Amino acid sequence: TIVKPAGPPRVGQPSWNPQRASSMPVNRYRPFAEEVEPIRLRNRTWPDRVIDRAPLWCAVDLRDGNQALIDPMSPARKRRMFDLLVRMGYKEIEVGFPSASQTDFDFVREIIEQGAIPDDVTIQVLTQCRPELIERTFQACSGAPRAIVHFYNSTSILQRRVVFRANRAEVQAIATDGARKCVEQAAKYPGTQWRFEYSPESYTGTELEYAKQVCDAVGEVIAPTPERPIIFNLPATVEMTTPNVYADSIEWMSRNLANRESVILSLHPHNDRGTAVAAAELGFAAGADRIEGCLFGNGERTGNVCLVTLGLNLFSRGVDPQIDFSNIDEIRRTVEYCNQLPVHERHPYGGDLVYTAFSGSHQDAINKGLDAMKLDADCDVDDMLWQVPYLPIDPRDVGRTYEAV
Amino acid sequence: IVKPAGPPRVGQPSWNPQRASSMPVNRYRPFAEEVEPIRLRNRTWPDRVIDRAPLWCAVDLRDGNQALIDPMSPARKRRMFDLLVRMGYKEIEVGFPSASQTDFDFVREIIEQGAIPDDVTIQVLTQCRPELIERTFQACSGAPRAIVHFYNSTSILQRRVVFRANRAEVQAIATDGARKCVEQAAKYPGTQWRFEYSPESYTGTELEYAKQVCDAVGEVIAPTPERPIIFNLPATVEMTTPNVYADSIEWMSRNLANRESVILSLHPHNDRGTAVAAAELGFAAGADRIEGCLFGNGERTGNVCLVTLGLNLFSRGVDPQIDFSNIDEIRRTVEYCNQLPVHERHPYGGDLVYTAFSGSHQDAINKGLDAMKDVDDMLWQVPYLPIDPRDVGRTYEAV
Numbered sequence: 001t002i003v004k005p006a007g008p009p010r011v012g013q014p015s016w017n018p019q020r021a022s023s024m025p026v027n028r029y030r031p032f033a034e035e036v037e038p039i040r041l042r043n044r045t046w047p048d049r050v051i052d053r054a055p056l057w058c059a060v061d062l063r064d065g066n067q068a069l070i071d072p073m074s075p076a077r078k079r080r081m082f083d084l085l086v087r088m089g090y091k092e093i094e095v096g097f098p099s100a101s102q103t104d105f106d107f108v109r110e111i112i113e114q115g116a117i118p119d120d121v122t123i124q125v126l127t128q129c130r131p132e133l134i135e136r137t138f139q140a141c142s143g144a145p146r147a148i149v150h151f152y153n154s155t156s157i158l159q160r161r162v163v164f165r166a167n168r169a170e171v172q173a174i175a176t177d178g179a180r181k182c183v184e185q186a187a188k189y190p191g192t193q194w195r196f197e198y199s200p201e202s203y204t205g206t207e208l209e210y211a212k213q214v215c216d217a218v219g220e221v222i223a224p225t226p227e228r229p230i231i232f233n234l235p236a237t238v239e240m241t242t243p244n245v246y247a248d249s250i251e252w253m254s255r256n257l258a259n260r261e262s263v264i265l266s267l268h269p270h271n272d273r274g275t276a277v278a279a280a281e282l283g284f285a286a287g288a289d290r291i292e293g294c295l296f297g298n299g300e301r302t303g304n305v306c307l308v309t310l311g312l313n314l315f316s317r318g319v320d321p322q323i324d325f326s327n328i329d330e331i332r333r334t335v336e337y338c339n340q341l342p343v344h345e346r347h348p349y350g351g352d353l354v355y356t357a358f359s360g361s362h363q364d365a366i367n368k369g370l371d372a373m374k375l376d377a378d379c380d381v382d383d384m385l386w387q388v389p390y391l392p393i394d395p396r397d398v399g400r401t402y403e404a405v
Numbered sequence: 406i407v408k409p410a411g412p413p414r415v416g417q418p419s420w421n422p423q424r425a426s427s428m429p430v431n432r433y434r435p436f437a438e439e440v441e442p443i444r445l446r447n448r449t450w451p452d453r454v455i456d457r458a459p460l461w462c463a464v465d466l467r468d469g470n471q472a473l474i475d476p477m478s479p480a481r482k483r484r485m486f487d488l489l490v491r492m493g494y495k496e497i498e499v500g501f502p503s504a505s506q507t508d509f510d511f512v513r514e515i516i517e518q519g520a521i522p523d524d525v526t527i528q529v530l531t532q533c534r535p536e537l538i539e540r541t542f543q544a545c546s547g548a549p550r551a552i553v554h555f556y557n558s559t560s561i562l563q564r565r566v567v568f569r570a571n572r573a574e575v576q577a578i579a580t581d582g583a584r585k586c587v588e589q590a591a592k593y594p595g596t597q598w599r600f601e602y603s604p605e606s607y608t609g610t611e612l613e614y615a616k617q618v619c620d621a622v623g624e625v626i627a628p629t630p631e632r633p634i635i636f637n638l639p640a641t642v643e644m645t646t647p648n649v650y651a652d653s654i655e656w657m658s659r660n661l662a663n664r665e666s667v668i669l670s671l672h673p674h675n676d677r678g679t680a681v682a683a684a685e686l687g688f689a690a691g692a693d694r695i696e697g698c699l700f701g702n703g704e705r706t707g708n709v710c711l712v713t714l715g716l717n718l719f720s721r722g723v724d725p726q727i728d729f730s731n732i733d734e735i736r737r738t739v740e741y742c743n744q745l746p747v748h749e750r751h752p753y754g755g756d757l758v759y760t761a762f763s764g765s766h767q768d769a770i771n772k773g774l775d776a777m778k779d780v781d782d783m784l785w786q787v788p789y790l791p792i793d794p795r796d797v798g799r800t801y802e803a804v
């Protein structure tokens with residue numbers, strides 16, 4: 001049942017606020033600062049930087065997406081999703097997890113063997129750090145012109161204790177032993193242009209100086225340069241606190257990571273507090289270079305950050321996302337087809353209801369803007385500055401329509 | 406769909422093969438130029454961590470309802486009101502009675518049947534034309550207390566294209582409304598009236614001006630610390646990043662006249678997908694009050710989600726002062742009232758948000774649950790599950 005909070009008000013709670021204390025077991029949860037650590041960052045700059053360029057995108061729909069699904073992608077559905085990501089303009093695509101999943105392996109073999117990989121596309125494959133998984137991962141990419149090997153291990157306070165029952169050095173040695181193995185294997189398969197990504201998985205549960213240490217040591221092995229750089233990918237595996245703190249944490253890593261101009265700083269935010277998009281946009285302003293997510297926000301649990309929202313959030317403020325969202329219906333249809341999961345009615349940009357006005361006063365206001373833009377134009381209306389109340393973008397700019405209803 | 410084939414940007418790294426799309430970005434301008442740059446010096450919100458629940462106002466019966474494909478029946482409206490009351494909300498916007506007969510009908514019914522608990526204050530939306538204000542007051546006849554929420558659009562775009570009207574002229578709309586509100590209140594003693602003013606399209610409005618109109622509306626209403634006014638600053642359209650919203654909110658809280666007779670309330674829509682962030686950063690900015698909906702119903706992309714805001718407090722150890730202990734029940738009732746599903750991936754309530762499919766995550770949660778072993782009272786320490794699903798009446802599902 002649902003029962004009205006009737007506990008005392010807080011000390012200092014103003015008289016005009018009649019809310020009462022719930023019976024929820026708040027004692028079981030700690031503020032982020034105590035669960036992990038306080039914010040390290042001094043003199044942040046991200047609040048003063050407006051994004052004026054698109055980042056490097058990496059679409060993880062085929063891995064992080066696929067793995068969160070109720071109904072796994074068939075070989076047909078993965079090809080279909082690969083082709084969409086390719087046609088949209090994406091250049092780095094995590095095509096799966098071939099050491100752990102025989103159908104992923106099957107998938108990678110297939111796109112390489114059939115010459116499905118375009119010349120400007122770099123496939124990305126996920127692996128854990130154990131040696132024979134790294135080997136399997138290299139065998140799966142055999143024949144590939146280029147590939148990102150993404151190796152990872154969990155570094156969080158919580159996971160060092162209850163999963164690995166291990167200390168800092170040992171947890172770092174896993175990553176570094178993982179980098180050695182990667183370097184060994186890449187020399188065993190010349191031809192392929194091998195590139196690396198390292199994630200301290202559960203980063204947002206990891207102490208920053210410790211995240212920096214592990215990354216730097218991974219860096220030492222790999223020996224990236226400004227022409228052949230490494231990716232350090234900082235996931236909010238669980239989105240653990242507000243977006244500003246994630247950004248602060250990104251700004252700290254970007255200032256502080258060793259060999260910074262040989263590093264591609266990548267964001268990988270999940271949406272557990274509903275703020276994955278904000279985490280990304282602020283973390284990009286904080287100095288990241290790259291963002292991993294999924295079309296329409298598919299991905300474990302609450303999902304990966306939404307590639308469509310981020311892309312169009314740039315477009316609608318005058319920045320070219322470098323991805324084609326001209327026909328958002330088509331993107332959505334393929335997405336829903338691949339994942340077997342609807343895009344919500346109220347999803348930003350693609351949801352069924354997002355260019356709908358039911359309010360009489362909003363329909364009238366939309367009519368005033370649309371009628372006004374005609375005047376100024378009589379150049380060509382479809383080319384003028386968009387100026388319509390309640391319609392952030394011209395719906396025809398993403399192939400949709402405004403409906404008064 | 407057409408692969409972007411334009412050139413790279415000047416100075417684009419060689420490791421980024423991305424090409425310019427053919428999308429008409431020249432039609433859109435940065436927020437700084439579309440409205441105004443950031444007015445806020447020495448912001449403080451980035452260093453403040455929320456340590457108490459805001460005053461919640463649910464707008465499901467008004468901003469939510471008007472967004473629906475299928476309008477709430479009288480029964481579904483009662484259901485929603487009851488859910489809101491039962492969860493512990495204390496201010497509920499019940500409709501737009503002056504311009505909607507079924508709204509008007511709903512208001513009469515909750516008042517006449519005694520469906521409002523004494524700690525609950527109903528809210529009614531009205532525009533500024535004087536016959537609409539009169540009608541709003543008539544709808545509330547017999548209520549022991551009510552918030553009359555009047556509003557008018559204040560944005561640069563709306564001043565120009567809708568009102569064909571200047572600053573001064575648009576503020577007199579608000580202040581003439583405030584004056585009418587004071588006349589009407591005097592005409593109906595026996596209800597304790599309180600006021601809310603929103604410069605509608607606030608995020609498309611210069612700040613100096615939004616403060617001007619608010620201060621002016623406030624001077625007429627003459628609020629006090631005991632009888633304070635609500636100034637509600639909506640992101641009618643979520644127009645930029647949530648930091649800038651938070652900034653704008655901080656500047657208004659810092660600079661609004663008679664600040665301790667004010668309840669600064671937030672009203673974020675979700676057009677950029679950052680409503681929850683706008684609210685949270687806006688609250689740290691020193692707002693006092695948030696309007697939203699359960700599960701983020703509302704115009705277009707929705708109001709900010711009251712469920713997400715609430716449980717985001719709980720899961721970091723702040724009592725939201727709202728019972729979310731049966732999220733399935735809250736969800737069932739919302740889906741029924743709205744005729745519109747909570748997404749599978751909606752925070753806290755979605756079908757899949759406590760599912761681990763991948764084996765490593767499954768192993769890891771089992772390490773966590775096993776280490777943990779009264780367990781239900783210990784600190785929740787499990788990888789990949791932000792909360793114990795049972796604290797919201799759900800279960801963890803290994804599949």
Ligand SMILES: CC(C)C(=O)C(=O)O
Pocket residue numbers: 064126152199201202235236237238268270
């Ligand atoms: C595999 C890792 C990078 C991941 O998906 C996450 O941590 O969110």
Ligand SMILES: CC(C)C(=O)C(=O)O
Pocket residue numbers: 468530556603605606639640641642672674
């Ligand atoms: C009525 C107003 C306050 C509103 O809902 C909005 O601005 O979104």
Ligand SMILES: [Mn+2]
Pocket residue numbers: 064235237268270300304
């Ligand atoms: Mn992930």
Ligand SMILES: [Mn+2]
Pocket residue numbers: 468639641672674703704708
């Ligand atoms: Mn609204």
